[PDB]
Design a protein around this ligand. Structure first.
Ligand SMILES: [Zn+2]
Length: 199
């Protein structure tokens, strides 16, 4: 009920940088984390333009004291610089390509965040699963008890997240040939973990 939803022709990742990065079917590259900040007003979610961004894993300077750190951590590191205003409600959307790590390290950090700032809705989206151990399981549960929304990246999210996290300057998304395949596959996995009753 207001003109129309804006885009983001600012300085976003290059069309290719995004695709190649989210190249469905990886094995080793660099975890990606796209955080989106939005305010909740009477069911009316207003997506901010100059408040969102994206990060990438880092592990090549552990000699300077900055031991290997995940994007999730290096990310929240900017929250203190935003001095959020709990005055109202907020909506932080997480877009991850790589599954979480030590459910206690990554998730834990978030858990406390909510337990202290439950005035914000955190949505977790896992596009690709890849870690050191299958611990990702406990991560799904430990998080579930947090209230956060855990789900696998969807096609609809790909289109939005695309034009949203890209300087498409007004260009469509390029999906690979096999969405129902990788989608049904991944989605099938999550469900499995979500299936702990009935039999
Ligand atoms: Zn982590």
């Amino acid at each position: 009920m207001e003109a129309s939803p804006a885009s983001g022709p600012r300085h976003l990742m290059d069309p290719h940088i995004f695709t190649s990065n989210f190249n469905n079917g990886i094995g080793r590259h660099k975890t990606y984390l796209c955080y989106e900040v939005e305010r909740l007003d009477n069911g009316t979610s207003v997506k901010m333009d100059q408040h969102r961004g994206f990060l990438h894993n880092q592990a090549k300077n552990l000699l300077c004291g900055f031991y290997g750190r995940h994007a999730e951590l290096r990310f929240l590191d900017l929250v203190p610089s935003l001095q959020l205003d709990p005055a109202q409600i907020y909506r932080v959307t997480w877009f991850i390509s790589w599954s979480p790590c030590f459910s206690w390290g990554c998730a834990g950090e978030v858990r406390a965040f909510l337990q202290e700032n439950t005035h914000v809705r955190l949505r977790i989206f896992a596009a690709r699963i890849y870690d050191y151990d299958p611990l990702y399981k406990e991560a799904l549960q430990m998080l579930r008890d947090a209230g956060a929304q855990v789900s696998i990246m969807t096609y609809d999210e790909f289109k939005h997240c695309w034009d949203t996290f890209v300087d498409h300057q007004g260009c469509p998304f390029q999906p690979w040939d096999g969405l129902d395949e990788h989608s049904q596959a991944l989605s099938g996995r999550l469900r499995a973990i979500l299936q702990n009753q009935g039999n």
